[PDB]
Amino acid sequence: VYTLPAGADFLMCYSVAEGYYSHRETVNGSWYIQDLCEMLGKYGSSLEFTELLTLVNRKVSQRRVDFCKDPSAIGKKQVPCFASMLTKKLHFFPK
Amino acid sequence: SVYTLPAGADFLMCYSVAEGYYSHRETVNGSWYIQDLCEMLGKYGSSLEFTELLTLVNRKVSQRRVDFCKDPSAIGKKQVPCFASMLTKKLHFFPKS
Amino acid sequence: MFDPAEKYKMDHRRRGIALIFNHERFFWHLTLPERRGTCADRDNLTRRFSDLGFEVKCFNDLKAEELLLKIHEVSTVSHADADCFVCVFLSHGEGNHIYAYDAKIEIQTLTGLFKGDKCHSLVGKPKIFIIQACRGNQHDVPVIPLD
Amino acid sequence: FDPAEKYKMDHRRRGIALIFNHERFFWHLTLPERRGTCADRDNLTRRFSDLGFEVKCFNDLKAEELLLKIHEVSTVSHADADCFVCVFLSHGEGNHIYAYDAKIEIQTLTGLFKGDKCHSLVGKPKIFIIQACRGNQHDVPVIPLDV
Ligand SMILES: *CCS(=O)(=O)N1CCC[C@@H](C(=O)Nc2ccc(OC(F)(F)F)cc2)C1
Ligand SMILES: *CCS(=O)(=O)N1CCC[C@@H](C(=O)Nc2ccc(OC(F)(F)F)cc2)C1
Ligand SMILES: [Cl-]
Ligand SMILES: [Cl-]
Ligand SMILES: [Cl-]
Ligand SMILES: [Cl-]
């Protein structure tokens, strides 16, 4: 067979791209974990996990800062970022 | 339709290697990563989702190893590429028109 | 045949461990803001990963020594009968570091424990890191498509 | 909310694929020549042309020339294009890529195509492909415990 790189088969899922702030709703948690969990609830046991993370990018991209003591932050945005060193399709079908 | 977009959304950053690592080459036919990317584009570019295709590129580059080097400690060494997605939708390159 | 539809083998006895490091407050001398709502995030992830068959192990406000001991321990147990590994950090960060309660830790130290040469029983298996942390001090700005 | 949603790829043109191909460097950079990059550039040109891209290749541009060319492409109309591809075949250092004579922050190059700078690519994919070493560690071979 072929050997693998010791760094293969990692998936790094970040709330934001390097350089940017991440955001939260006042009480119910971060934008990113709320939207990740909603997508896990609806699609986690069927969709390929990177397809699911792409839906999370779309969902978080719809959010905006509604309330902030800094008025320059109002209306500001976030897109998450996932970095894949995966080599195969990843599914969490029911066991 | 109803929502604004982040100015940084819908970027895809495709790297030959993860941060911190050397990338490799054959030298006649070029880099491991561009050779395997181009082979997958040739076979699957017009059908597969582009991140699905990049995952096949990760698998193909992961199969390679350093066979010849003046540094003998480098023999058998390895590379995995890395793609960073800020995409929000599926990306296909179906034939135009 | 190189099969473009190839899936990771996910028919092991166990899904695997989902580790969650949940950081709400920090050592006063770090002058880091409280992460109000992180307990909702931790509970939401616990439910969703449990529903996907993970053994969820949550740790709240660990200090650097405690967090390193715990993650090192998980890296040295057998994952031979597991499909995969998930590790979640809910905290502040700085560059390529994540904050424990008292100090920051290089992210490469944490992922390094699960690399193929350190964690033989996860070779060929997905290692999934999920990091909720700001990664700089710029706010992304809103745009709309032309038309 | 449709989980199968695809980018709109039915515009008149696929769009531009920009390729910055760097084989040799200003002698005072002490950077090794990139023997084989010619093969990579030609291979990409064929594959992207076959996918409908207008491929525009530049060999061994100096920093000023590279910035002028990429700024030009960021300020033309992509209203009738599906997407944008940009390829760098060069050496790098941290979050920099090398032109012939000097390094350039990758964020300056990607930044030109952000939605607030490039209105006609808003809602469209921007794809950056970078063939460059990203440090001085060789990854090591491992085998799954199963075999
Ligand atoms: C109104 C303040 S803001 O929106 O301009 N912004 C300032 C920069 C930091 C941002 C922030 O607080 N981010 C954040 C903190 C904690 C998080 O986790 C959570 F607490 F669990 F939700 C997520 C995001 C705010
Ligand atoms: C035997 C030398 S090695 O394989 O240990 N290794 C040392 C570190 C750098 C590696 C290398 O040359 N990588 C590389 C250089 C140039 C590239 O672009 C290309 F020339 F177009 F292919 C790709 C990869 C060698
Ligand atoms: Cl998707
Ligand atoms: Cl963002
Ligand atoms: Cl800002
Ligand atoms: Cl091994």
Author numbering:
A (entry chain F): 197 to 291
B (entry chain B): 196 to 292
C (entry chain E): 30 to 176
D (entry chain A): 31 to 177
Quote what the paper states about this structure.
One successful foray in this vein produced analogue 2a (R = p-OCF3), in which the nipecotic acid core was reoriented, with the piperidine nitrogen displaying a vinylsulfonamide. Analogue 2a, having the 3R configuration, exhibited markedly superior C264 engagement compared to its 3S enantiomer 2b, with a mass spectrometry-based dose–response-50 (DR50) value of 0.08 μM and a C6 inhibition IC50 value of 0.180 μM, indicating that inhibition by 2a involved both molecular recognition and reaction with C264. The crystal structure of 2a bound to C6 confirmed the covalent modification of residue C264, whose α-carbon atom moved ∼2.4 Å toward the substrate-binding groove, compared to the structure of C6 bound to a VEID peptide substrate analogue. Informed by this structure, we explored new piperidine substitutions, seeking to engage additional pockets in the active site. A complex X-ray crystal structure of 3a showed similarities and differences as compared to the binding of 2a. Both analogues engaged C264 in a covalent bond as expected, while the trifluoromethoxyaryl side chain of both analogues was buried in the S1 pocket, where the aspartic acid residue of the C6 substrate is usually bound. However, the location and orientation of the piperidine ring and sulfonamide function were quite different in the two analogues. Lamin A cleavage was inhibited by 2a with an IC50 value of 14.2 ± 2.4 μM and by 3a with an IC50 value of 170 ± 4 nM. Importantly, 2a and 3a inhibited lamin A cleavage in a manner that tracked well with their biochemical potencies, with 2a roughly 50-fold less potent than 3a.
Caspases are cysteine-dependent aspartyl-specific proteases involved in a range of cellular and disease processes, ranging from apoptosis to inflammation and neurodegeneration. Caspase family members are broadly classified as inflammatory (C1, C4, and C5) or apoptotic caspases. While often classified as an executioner caspase, the function of caspase-6 (C6) in physiology and disease has remained enigmatic, and it has been suggested that C6 may act upstream of the other executioner caspases. C6 possesses a non-catalytic cysteine (C264) not present in other family members and is situated on a loop in the small subunit at the distal end of the active site. The catalytic cysteine (C163) is found on the large subunit, while two additional cysteine residues appear to be buried and thus inaccessible for disulfide formation.
